[model samples]
Target: GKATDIYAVNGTEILLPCTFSSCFGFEDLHFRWTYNSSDAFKILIEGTVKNEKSDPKVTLKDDDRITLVGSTKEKMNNISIVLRDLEFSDTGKYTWHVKNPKENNLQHHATIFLQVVDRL
Candidate 1:
């Protein structure tokens, strides 16, 4: 995997990368995504948590300001973050974290630093 920096304008889109070391297949593992709102925490999407091993969470928070584009799971273990409709307040560090209560919980494979540029 490579380190990437995603930039976007207000109302634009962004994506984050993620994965586990042992995820050989989509059913073998699970994924979850969240957002730090500076004051509170928002769960945009969760695969194992809510899907019960069904559909992998693709979007985290879907609002007029934010939208999760895709969350795909493959045998290679790839979790990417995709956000659309960005805003100025969206400027900050966005992380893609995973949780496995009885197993392991990783902070984030990558952190997306969003610097919203005003349309001047």
Candidate 2:
């Protein structure tokens, strides 16, 4: 898994990046996002591949300001997560898990540690 550290200002938006290559199909992948707190991993969003012809099966739990946005369907190389209206409490560790069920032993993972500070 890749590890990245980022900093953002309060009351702004930040994009947490996760990218992978050599996927079988964009519509056949599974994505999971979680936040780490007190050694516990809480799920933020979990879902299979989203497409134009299908309704999203992604579940966004307990957070309304988090949005899953990226180029997984067309580009297949970027799976970015968007966090809006950043606050001081939004600083933490976030993990992303991407799996291709159609391909054996094919998975991508990344962790991001975000630090939000006062506006400059």
Candidate 3:
């Protein structure tokens, strides 16, 4: 789940890719999007399980600026997250955690470096 650094304008939006192999089934899938700054973790998007009948399959931490942008349908592996209205303060290393209960409680983590600059 290696990712490249992401650069965005102060007010623009950016998508953090978190693609993985389809070998991991969607059942009992859980994921969290966190921002790492000052050696601490800020839960940008909390983790939640996605049932086959549910639509979103994810939860946000009472924030509207971030959202899960990917398909929950079967056979799709894209589970990217979208950050909107990027600000200079949002610059940090974002971490993505994905847990699959079936693989004997297997978990995966990935990081994305974000840099937000002024629009001028």
Candidate 4:
């Protein structure tokens, strides 16, 4: 997927919009949120399918500045991640990916750019 551009102030909160849809289904729907800084991909969140039969729970999230605000109810999963109190260091591309490791390899990839400036 190509990169979409968006900007924000240095000390503000921003929501990275990443709406996803799966053609197959949500059987083994596994999604991830990553921040690409200097080519380093940091796994911010990992939503797994192990604990299915209910809403996808937060399995992996190590960043204090992150919060997952999305859904796994319908085929249209609103997989959006939030970053609060942004800084110049948070200026980069946040990638959204979903993969069904079931070889049905049904996968999706998206990119969103965030440029944090001193002021508007």
Candidate 5:
């Protein structure tokens, strides 16, 4: 099974939204999403997350592959990951992680299989 898999048009901006369902209160409050590349590359997005409790748990290396698209609080926890300068390397399995430290719960987590193709 797939959590929301699809291909994107090359040279175009794709908004890969990972929707998650969790308990009443969310720990970490903030969200930490990650993605894996072909060449043993991995990136994580944290900080500045909407309704975030404190600092983010996941950390990202100093690179130019992952970019924070947008985030929301309260109702919808829609965290967008923008793949700028799209490349074939960006095509792979991406995981979204939402954690709550105080609650010590996984909160929310989902997988997205992505493929990048020529622009339609």
Candidate 6:
């Protein structure tokens, strides 16, 4: 898994980036974002979107403070999110997973460490 570190101000905005690519095109890219609020990772968002389709469908929306800033339909490779008004509890490990069934379930994984602070 690829690992990244992020230090963000408590009340500021932050980007959690997860860019993915595939040798073969996807009929529907199956992907998910998970947050480590505890020992087990909880699903933040799960969806299927194709770059050519230019449309995104997800299972859930997080909250007022967090949103899908960059999506696969928009950037093809980028599926990132923005969190505004970061909070203390927002500090944790965020993991991204993507599976491309077109290539026989080819997968990629990455994790990000986010630390929310009073100042950065």
The candidate that achieves the highest lDDT relative to the unseen native structure: 6
lDDT by residue for model 5 (58-92), tens:
35533455555446455435455666667776788
Q: What is the TM-score (0 to 1) of candidate 4?
A: 0.77
Candidate 1: clashing pairs of residues: 11-86, 15-81, 16-81, 18-79, 44-60, 44-61, 45-60
User: Which candidate gets the maximum TM-score versus the true structure?
Assistant: 6
Clashing pairs in 3: none
RMSD of 3: 3.4
What CA root-mean-square deviation does each model show from the true structure?
Answer: 5.2, 3.2, 3.4, 3.3, 3.9, 3.0
Which stretch of 10 consecutive residues in model 6 shows the poorest summed lDDT? 70-79
Residues 5-110, candidate 2, lDDT per residue (tens digit)? 8999999999886655453355666778888856666888877765423444675555888776644554334456788999888888888888878678756787
RMSD of 6: 3.0
Which segments of candidate 6 are over 4 A away from where they belong? 23-27, 37-40, 71-78
Q: Write the per-residue lDDT of candidate 4 for residues 1-120, one digit (tens) a residue.
A: 489899998889897765665354645668788888776778888886533344566789968888755444543355567799988988988888877787656578888888998876
- Regions of model 1 farther than 4 Å from truth: 1-5, 19-27, 49-78, 99-109
Q: How high is each candidate's TM-score?
A: 0.56, 0.77, 0.77, 0.77, 0.67, 0.79
Model 5: what TM-score? Answer: 0.67
The candidate with the higher lDDT, 1 or 2, is 2
Report RMSD for candidate 5: 3.9
> What C-alpha root-mean-square deviation, in Å, does candidate 4 show against the real structure?
3.3
Off by over 4 Å in 2: 23-27, 50-56, 70-78
